[PDB]
Ligand binder design. Structure first.
Ligand SMILES: O=C(CNc1cccc(F)c1)N[C@@H](C(=O)NO)c1ccc(Br)cc1
Ligand SMILES: [Mg+2]
Ligand SMILES: [Mg+2]
Ligand SMILES: [Zn+2]
Length: 890
């Protein structure tokens, strides 16, 4: 009886918690938590027992109105629920109090109160607050918080919680306390406490409209405080963006960001006290790869934007998760697009969605962005809820345009500020803007709500007609979502299709900006006074989260790739050319294998496509990040959505052939660009200025490192010389790339030892080194992973360490999917081992298995055997069991 929670079952509690008064006393062997809950009986009360969530708590005593309750007669506790029998529950306002013991030192699951290195830190979302003290641990129980933290002063000089610090005091025996009062109501998942020997950088921010001074503090352990500078700049940028785009100011006197080494995810938006995985807050040019800079910008931005979308407007219940996470990812994405000013930012989010999230949505794990049920709330945090949620949130902007979107968002904030909300509240606010935009009080967005309830990726397909005599162009559009286990019957969605029409003679735009509103299963959109047969530029900006079936020829796609104005359609046209090639070569390789052919033919790569790649690479005005995408084949996890029973060896052979076909024609171009890009890509002018971040320059390094990888796999003449020189670059993105691309040479372990020595004295850099080794294209990768286990990883319980060692390796198409199943067995062993102390990270480590039923039948069987073996572990967590049961359709 695992307990399934159903969305439709939501009901308000029969109780109210008005005030929380906490005393958290941190000692060497245990932490004592005293809590007084000022409570009341709600209008929904029907005489029920008072049931608190409380997981793993050691009760010293519990009381109601300062009378101790007697265990067994007046309450029972089973280590997960505290039940006070209703006859002992007061009928009016009452105080519930308790003193419990918890043990952050041994809390390796990193939820509740835990110790990360020498920092005590909390993580309460989603169900962590009940691991600190008793509570009705659900986001609609809004309360005021008065929190006192005490600790050894020498070990823990910096004490932080939500709200204003109202008192600091000394305590006999070398201890000290601080009291924080946070009067605004909040759900308990936004509570946080931090204690440690933290060092900070700080700044003052003056808000745009009210001219309020906000103190900004960024904290880390002392060793890494020099890595906080970029994060502080990102925070300032985030504040300014919400002010400028949304007209939203921060409301509190202070905002703290804190980095900790042990963290299950990226960061957490606790009010006034955002807590980060160190890998998403700390960077320096000497000790971080380039990706750290966009990561810190987006994660700092993301947690900041939660202050409105999640904190001030919060959730009624956890099924609304996408209302704060999809919306905050959308706000994050707008922010990062404006901050980076590169088209690759949007392309990178599409690239993530169509690989990772599309795979999830065609898997047995498929769910709508608002699921109907759950067992483990932690399994709800998914790329579907986050990234498809973000695309659903972004479609409102595409449909409404900026002006009316901003009006609708402001309606949402004004109407729900300080309250809980549901997805309907957001859709209602957008609907008001829709009415305004359409000048039609009857217009509604009722159909739009299916984006919240309908799982699965829509497929959108096209047919075209041009009447030259009439100058009349027609686009016939069809939408189809495959039935799945959530809906037998799928319904047509409100799909906005941003379109242009390119004149194939001169590459020019043929019509103004147009967004087709597809609301039926099919429609025909006609355009008059189209002087010449156009090439349609469909779903510009990737305007809906769908499979696009453009039915264009490769000649048409090539022309869009060269000449269209829209970065996404160019990238997608290139993607589609590659996919046609991959599917064709895959089937030719497969047939040869199946028929045991002694000889056979392969269809070559389209020569005009290769010419078009060359043309774009040689265009000095073209974006270097975009160029890096066009020379890269689509992600394996994008491809697998298009192949049944995918044989990973055959796919590996297919990609190799296509990369070789192209490199045989373009390697001299790749080499020449690799060399000519050096000066601007590796410019050291601002290497010691942590405020100066140039996303274009970083994209040129991406392009250089992509080209170097291509040339190294090709064994381009004397490229090992370039690899060795590149290992001497000051930039870790370069010298770690030199390690990875040296895999094809006898110098690999020389560079392995060199880069280890460069990486070993920075915690986060070492983790980047581990990832690079893990992802190295090495025939001896299994022996290398054993070396990492024995010599570096050891028995670390740090999630960054475990993820770094194992997850990149699972993208090794040839070796992770070794037909013996040894790679599946390896990851399953790591999952089961990790599950003993950290169920959430154990489920993250399951991610390679998400495509299990898409592989060839033997690998299906191998993966299924490992997950059935994992499901049979007597000690399996609820999180892992529920995940594997759903993934294996059991
Ligand atoms: O750090 C991230 C990265 N996103 C993310 C992570 C895991 C799965 C997934 F689909 C997306 N997410 C934060 C967040 O939303 N911070 O605001 C978060 C996630 C889970 C919980 Br429990 C609390 C917080
Ligand atoms: Mg305990
Ligand atoms: Mg199923
Ligand atoms: Zn979030």
């Amino acid at each position: 009886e695992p307990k399934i929670h159903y969305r439709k079952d939501y009901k308000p509690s029969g109780f109210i918690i008005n005030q929380v008064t906490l005393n958290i006393n941190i000692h060497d062997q245990e932490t004592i938590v005293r809590s007084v809950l000022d409570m009341d009986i709600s209008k929904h009360n029907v005489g029920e027992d008072l049931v608190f969530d409380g997981v793993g708590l050691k009760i010293n005593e519990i009381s109601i109105n300062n009378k101790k309750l007697v265990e067994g007669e007046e309450y029972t506790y089973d280590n997960e629920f505290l039940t006070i029998f209703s006859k002992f529950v007061p009928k009016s306002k009452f105080a519930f109090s308790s003193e419990v013991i918890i043990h952050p030192e041994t809390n390796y699951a990193l939820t509740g109160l835990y110790k990360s290195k020498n920092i005590i830190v909390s993580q309460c979302e989603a169900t962590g607050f009940r691991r600190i003290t008793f509570f009705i641990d659900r986001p609609d129980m809004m309360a005021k918080y008065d929190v006192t933290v005490t600790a050894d002063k020498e070990k823990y000089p910096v004490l932080l919680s939500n709200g204003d610090k109202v008192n600091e005091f000394e305590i006999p025996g070398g201890r000290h306390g601080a009291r924080f009062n946070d009067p605004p109501l909040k759900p308990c998942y936004l509570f946080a406490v931090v204690a440690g020997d933290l060092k900070h950088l700080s700044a003052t921010y003056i808000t745009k409209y009210t001219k309020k001074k906000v103190e900004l503090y960024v904290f880390s352990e002392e060793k890494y405080v020099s890595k906080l500078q970029w994060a502080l700049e990102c925070l300032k940028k985030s504040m300014a963006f919400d002010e400028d785009y949304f007209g939203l100011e921060y409301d509190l006197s202070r905002l703290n960001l804190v980095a900790v080494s042990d963290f299950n995810v990226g960061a957490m938006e606790n009010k006034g006290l955002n807590i980060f995985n160190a890998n998403s807050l700390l960077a320096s040019k000497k000790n971080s790869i380039d990706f750290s800079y966009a990561r810190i910008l987006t994660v700092v931005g993301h947690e900041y934007f939660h202050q409105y979308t999640g904190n001030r407007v919060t959730l009624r219940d956890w099924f609304q998760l996408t209302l704060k996470e999809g919306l905050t990812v959308h706000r994050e994405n707008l922010f990062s697009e404006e901050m980076t000013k590169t088209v690759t930012t949007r392309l990178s989010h599409v690239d993530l969605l169509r690989s990772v999230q599309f795979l999830e949505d065609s898997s047995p794990l498929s769910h709508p962005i608002r699921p109907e049920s759950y067992v483990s709330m932690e399994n709800f945090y998914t790329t579907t809820v986050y990234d498809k949620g973000s695309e659903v949130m972004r479609m409102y902007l595409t449909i409404l345009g900026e002006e009316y979107y901003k009006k609708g968002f402001d309606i949402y904030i004004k109407k729900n500020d300080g309250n809980t909300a549901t997805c309907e509240d957001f859709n209602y606010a957008m609907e008001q803007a829709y009415k305004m935009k359409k000048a039609d009080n009857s217009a509604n967005l009722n159909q739009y709500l299916l984006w919240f309830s309908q799982s699965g990726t829509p497929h959108v397909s096209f047919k075209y007609n041009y009447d030259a005599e009439k100058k009349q162009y027609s686009i016939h559009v069809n939408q189809y979502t495959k039935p799945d286990e959530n809906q037998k019957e799928k319904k047509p969605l409100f799909i906005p299709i941003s379109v242009g029409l390119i004149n194939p003679e001169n590459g020019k735009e043929m019509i103004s900006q147009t967004t087709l509103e597809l609301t039926k299963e099919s429609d025909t959109f006609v355009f008059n006074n189209i002087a010449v047969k156009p090439i349609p530029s469909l779903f510009r900006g990737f305007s809906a989260p769908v499979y696009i079936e453009d039915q264009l020829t490769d000649e048409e796609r090539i022309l869009l790739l060269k000449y269209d104005s829209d970065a996404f359609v160019r990238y997608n046209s290139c993607t589609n050319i590659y996919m046609k090639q991959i599917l064709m070569n895959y089937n030719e390789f497969l047939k040869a294998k199946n028929e045991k052919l002694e000889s056979f033919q392969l269809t070559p790569v389209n020569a005009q496509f290769i010419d078009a790649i060359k043309y774009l690479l040689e265009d000095p005005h073209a974006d270097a990040g975009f160029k890096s995408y066009i020379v890269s084949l689509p992600q394996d996890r994008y491809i697998i959505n298009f192949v049944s029973n995918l044989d990973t060896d055959v796919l590996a052979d297919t990609k190799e052939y296509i990369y070789k076909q192209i490199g045989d024609k373009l390697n001299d171009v790749y080499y020449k660009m690799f060399k000519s890009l050096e000066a601007k890509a590796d410019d050291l002018t601002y290497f010691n200025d942590e405020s100066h971040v140039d996303f274009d320059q970083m994209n040129m390094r991406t392009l250089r490192n992509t080209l170097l990888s291509l040339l190294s796999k090709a064994q381009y003449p004397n490229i090992l010389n370039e690899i060795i020189e590149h290992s001497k670059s000051p930039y870790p993105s370069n010298w770690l790339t030199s390690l990875s691309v040296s895999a094809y040479f006898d110098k690999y372990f020389e560079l392995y030892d060199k880069t280890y020595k460069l990486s070993k004295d920075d915690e986060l850099l070492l983790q980047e080194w581990l990832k690079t080794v893990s992802r190295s294209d090495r025939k001896d990768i299994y022996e290398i992973l054993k070396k990492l286990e024995n010599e570096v990883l050891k028995d670390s319980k740090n999630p960054n360490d475990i993820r770094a060692v194992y997850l990149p390796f699972t993208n090794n198409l040839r070796r992770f999917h070794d037909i013996s199943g040894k790679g599946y067995k390896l990851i399953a062993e790591v999952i089961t081992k990790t599950d003993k102390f950290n169920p959430m990270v154990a489920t993250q480590l399951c991610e390679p298995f998400k495509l299990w039923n898409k592989l060839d039948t033997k690998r299906q069987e191998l993966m299924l055997n490992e997950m059935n073996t994992m499901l049979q572990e007597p000690q399996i967590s609820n999180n892992l069991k529920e995940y594997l049961l759903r993934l294996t359709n059991k």
